[PDB]
Design a protein around this ligand. Structure first.
Ligand code: CA
Ligand code: CA
Length: 279
């Protein structure tokens, strides 16, 4: 399949080179996979989700995404137009309030929730969790992310937007998950992207168009936007049978575009998520 005039990030993860405009992908499109978006929620009614999104848990008064961020991230995972894995199932877990903030105890609970809830879902191609969030280092946050990964979920987390070493942020600094830095359309590390040895992969993160609340769309930037590209790619590769939840991060790093990015500090991987699709 080929989506013409795709968002740059989708084009980029199906190209060896920057500057293309078509997103090339196997039509399986993540069918049979599931991705939990652990964030401010998902506006499941957005037409772009085609009925494939649902809220499954909230830690606040409502399950509504009153912010947008979670809807955006979900759209990069699996919306029709803006998503990597256009046929995946999306599950929303609202751990962040409508200002985009959340307490670590709540975030931890949301991870534990996914680890359990997945056992109640029919996700034959496997389960991914996308965590476009983080704060300062916390061993308990990292441990929760590690547990979620261990439970059989491919966990992708944002590196953080501090232009600093991700070792000081969580869950970015948890080694066992897939920690995702952000790039821009010119293959530069995004100006705000964290870096460091703990990064596994980069994905598109600057000026990413996706769904927004109110049935809208908008472009925003962040490692929060890079993370769902990776989560969606994992879902897509799992549906293809190329990898598993346990191995997807490594597979993605293995099969990434290597050495394409600029302003990568020495000791940070130079790896950009790539689907390797061949028609
Ligand atoms: Ca290249
Ligand atoms: Ca890792």
């Amino acid at each position: 399949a080929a989506q013409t005039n795709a968002p740059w990030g989708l084009a980029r993860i199906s190209s060896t080179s920057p500057g293309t405009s078509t997103y090339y992908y196997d039509e399986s499109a993540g069918q049979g996979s599931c991705v939990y978006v652990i964030d401010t929620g998902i506006e499941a009614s957005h037409p772009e989700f085609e009925g494939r999104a649902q809220m499954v848990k909230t830690y606040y008064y409502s399950s509504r995404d009153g912010n947008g961020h979670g809807t955006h991230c979900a759209g990069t995972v699996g919306s029709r137009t803006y998503g990597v894995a256009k046929k995946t199932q999306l599950f929303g877990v609202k751990v962040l309030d409508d200002n985009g903030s959340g307490q670590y105890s709540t975030i931890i609970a949301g991870m534990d929730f996914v680890a359990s809830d997945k056992n109640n879902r029919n996700c034959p191609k496997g389960v991914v969790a996308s965590l476009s969030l983080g704060g300062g280092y916390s061993s308990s946050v990292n441990s929760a992310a590690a547990r979620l990964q261990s439970s059989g979920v491919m966990v992708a987390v944002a590196a953080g937007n501090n232009n600093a070493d991700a070792r000081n942020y969580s869950p970015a600094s948890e080694p066992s998950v897939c920690t995702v830095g952000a790039s821009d359309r010119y293959d530069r590390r995004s100006s705000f992207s964290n870096y460091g040895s703990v990064l596994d992969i980069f994905g598109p993160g600057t000026d990413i168009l996706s769904t927004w609340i109110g049935g809208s769309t908008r472009s925003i930037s962040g490692t929060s936007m890079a993370t769902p590209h990776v989560a969606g790619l994992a879902a897509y590769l799992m549906t293809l049978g190329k990898t598993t939840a346990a191995s997807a991060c490594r597979y993605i790093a293995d099969t990434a575009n290597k050495g394409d990015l600029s302003n990568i500090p020495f000791g940070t991987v130079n790896l950009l998520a790539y689907n390797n699709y061949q028609a």
